[PDB]
A paper describes a structure:
The discovery of the founding member of the [name] family of lanthanide-binding proteins demonstrated that nature has evolved macromolecules surpassing the selectivity of synthetic f-element chelators. The natural lanthanide-binding protein lanmodulin ([name])4,5 is a sustainable alternative to conventional solvent-extraction-based separation. First, LanMs possess four EF-hand motifs. Second, adjacent EF hands in LanMs are separated by 12–13 residues—rather than the typical ≈25 residues in CaII-responsive EF-hand proteins—resulting in an unusual three-helix bundle architecture with the metal-binding sites on the periphery.
Finally, we report a 1.01-Å-resolution structure of NdIII–Mex-[name], which rationalizes Mex-[name]’s shallower RE selectivity trend. EF hands comprise 12-residue, carboxylate-rich metal-binding loops flanked by α-helices, which traditionally respond to CaII binding;29 in Mex-[name], however, EF hands 1–3 bind lanthanide(III) ions with low-picomolar affinity and 108-fold selectivity over CaII, resulting in a large, lanthanide-selective disorder-to-order conformational transition. EF4 binds with only micromolar affinity. Unusually among RE chelators, Mex-[name] favours the larger and more abundant light REs (LREs), especially LaIII–SmIII, over heavy REs (HREs). The metal-binding sites of Mex-[name] differ substantially from those of Hans-[name]. Although the NdIII sites of Mex-[name] share the nine- and ten-coordination observed in DyIII– and LaIII–Hans-[name], they structurally resemble the seven-coordinate CaII-binding sites of calmodulin. The increased coordination numbers in Mex-[name] relative to calmodulin result from bidentate coordination of D5 and an additional solvent ligand. The observation of the two solvent molecules per metal site and the hydrogen bond to the D9 residue validates recent spectroscopic studies.
Residue numbers in the entry: 29 to 133
Write the structure that this text describes.
């Protein structure tokens, strides 16, 4: 779950596209019943039930891929307070960085 796992272009950092691509792959593997959404049971250990509600604007109890990717973007921004478009190893290790990793691993 280090930088290298999420950095296909070998610049040493994760950009928003790289985080989103990893988030999409994580979404797909976290939805084995192929309904196109993630519920609290599927996200256990990564996103708590309390945090899921905050990420689900239409309050249907699940996250579709668009909602999940929006959550990835919000967590990327939260882990990148210098607003420089990339997450480095220091930022990935931060508490906010760990929450990004839990969405995209
Ligand atoms: Nd990169
Ligand atoms: Nd599902
Ligand atoms: Nd929803
Ligand atoms: Nd940065």
């Amino acid at each position: 779950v280090d930088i290298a796992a999420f950095d296909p272009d070998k610049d040493g950092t994760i950009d928003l596209k790289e985080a989103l691509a990893a988030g999409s792959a994580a979404f797909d593997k976290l939805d084995p019943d192929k309904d196109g959404t993630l519920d609290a049971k599927e996200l256990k250990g990564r996103v708590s039930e309390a945090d899921l509600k905050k990420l689900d604007p239409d309050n249907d109890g699940t996250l579709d891929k668009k909602e999940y990717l929006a959550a990835v973007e919000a967590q990327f921004k939260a882990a990148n307070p210098d607003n420089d478009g990339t997450i480095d190893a220091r930022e990935l290790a931060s508490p906010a960085g760990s929450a990004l990793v839990n969405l995209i691993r």
